[PDB]
Amino acid sequence: MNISDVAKITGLTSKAIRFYEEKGLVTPPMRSENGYRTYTQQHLNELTLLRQARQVGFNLEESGELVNLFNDPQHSADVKRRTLEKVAEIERHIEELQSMRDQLLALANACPGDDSADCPIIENLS
Amino acid sequence: MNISDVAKITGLTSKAIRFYEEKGLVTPPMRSENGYRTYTQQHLNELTLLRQARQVGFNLEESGELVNLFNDPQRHSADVKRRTLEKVAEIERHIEELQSMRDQLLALANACPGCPIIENLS
Ligand SMILES: [Ag+]
Ligand SMILES: [Ag+]
């Protein structure tokens, strides 16, 4: 498979794919007779893991580490640890959003909601 | 007050304060006789509102409009309320998105001993 095939299959652009290689986040593909990158199923799995990990919350570095763990013959407990930590991270984010949502709704309920200039929302946000 | 003092008081970096000025989202700072930026309580209020609006979820343009409404003696509270309820709906969507992400990670984790997590993500 050439880089265009991988882009189509993974949904990643060829630039993003070259980027992942450039940052050593994935295994470097070998070169064909004419010098073009040749990809294997392993590359597809690494790029998929990278794309999906990101989509579910892991950042670049974290995603790169998951790829590292993936290629390792040997870490169920470890990956679980990383995953549960991601969950805790997301829950704190959910908690913060919920808090801001409730603060806005408390202010909104206090708002005259009319043509008067008096506004608790603006006054308490500034 | 100079920009350093404003940064400490507002909790914004000097970078951010200068950025808001460059974007025309805040009343420009004054220049002292020595040519350097000086600020008043008015600037503090606008920057505070700006900092808090961005934190709660308002983007740049929206935050700038809140600063305008703030400076408008004839502002209509109804307008601020409408904008606020619209932002709340957005936050709700964000929350739901995070909850589904969390649900998926916990599903993977539940299926794992001590790897279903890596096999499915890859
Ligand atoms: Ag109001
Ligand atoms: Ag596992």
How would you describe this structure to a colleague?
Two copies of one chain form a homodimer. With 126 residues, chain A is mostly helical. The first copy, chain A, has one domain: Multidrug-efflux Transporter Regulator, Chain: A, Domain 2 (Orthogonal Bundle), CATH 1.10.1660.10. Chain A has a two-stranded antiparallel sheet with strand order 1-2. In chain A, helix 3 runs antiparallel to helix 4. The longest helix of chain A is centred in the C-terminal third of the chain and has 35 residues. The radius of gyration of chain A is 23 Å and the shape is elongated. The interface between A and B is large, with 46 and 46 residues. The structure holds silver ion (AG) (2 copies). One silver ion (AG) sits at the interface of chains A and B. Chain A: Regulates the transcription of the copA and cueO genes. It detects cytoplasmic copper stress and activates transcription in response to increasing copper concentrations. Chain A: This is HTH-type transcriptional regulator CueR. Chain A: Its main location: cytoplasm. Chain A: InterPro entries: CueR (IPR011789), DNA-bd_dom_put_sf (IPR009061), MerR-type_HTH_dom (IPR000551), MerR_fam (IPR047057). Chain A: One of its GO terms (molecular function) is DNA-binding transcription factor activity.
